[PDB]
Design a protein around this ligand. Sequence first.
Ligand SMILES: O=C(NCc1ccccc1)c1ccc2c(c1)cc(C(=O)O)n2Cc1ccc(Cl)c(F)c1
Lengths: 270, 11
Amino acid sequence: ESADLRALAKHLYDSYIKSFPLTKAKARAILTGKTTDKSPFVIYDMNSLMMGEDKIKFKHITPLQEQSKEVAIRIFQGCQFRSVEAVQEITEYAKSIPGFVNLDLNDQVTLLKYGVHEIIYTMLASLMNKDGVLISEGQGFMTREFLKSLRKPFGDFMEPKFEFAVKFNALELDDSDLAIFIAVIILSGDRPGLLNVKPIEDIQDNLLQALELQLKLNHPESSQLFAKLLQKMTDLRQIVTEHVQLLQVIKKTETDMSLHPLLQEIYKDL
Amino acid sequence: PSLLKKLLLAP
Ligand SMILES: O=C(NCc1ccccc1)c1ccc2c(c1)cc(C(=O)O)n2Cc1ccc(Cl)c(F)c1
């Protein structure tokens, strides 16, 4: 049984490389300054943001800068745009996981709907230092302090993401580990409204074995790593909860904020 | 029409 589980881990890691353009390996290389490439443009303040504002990939009728008078809104829009693309990359990876295609589509939609936010925050940690986050596919770096400067409620918007990333990065997971971990999160059988729970948990049980084999082999000296990682899964639930509350406060609080239809689908009835 | 469903039935 050991040989079949190892093949699954390989399958997932290959799909992961195919699906996700900026990997942890690449992100860490950039963050550690070990790269042929020139260092990212650092946005730490309003002036740096203005010069680097053009670098941000916001695609719309008007340029990012003209989009709002208020800078926290423009950053918010950039995050939402990246999230829409992130959901596409996750969905593509979800289709790669064995048996996911066979399940009921409505189940497949339910799993993505709850899964995506938790996966995004996992992979965001790959982009994160204690001091900031790589943005725009590595081309820029926005500091944690600058994100924390923005007026309320936006100032506290990214901070739990940073707090989670410090703890999660301390696990020192590599890309191969993450591929399986992510697969496990997608295949959670306790999502509200799932029609057929049994096939889901069946796959998730298989994924969980591959994961702990992966972690023993890849991280032999790390005692109870599997345990620590499962506990994180529960932490992610709690980040998303926090995040949704904040969106509602924005919803009623800000008239200007506009939500993409894809996000809007995931957010409704959550 | 779910947009997620549309993404799922994509190639
Ligand atoms: O909570 C996030 N999504 C949920 C969400 C949903 C509705 C509106 C806003 C939020 C989130 C936050 C930050 C994120 C990403 C996702 C993905 C990236 C990424 O891949 O870079 N980042 C970093 C980042 C930081 C600053 C700028 Cl300006 C930016 F464009 C991107």
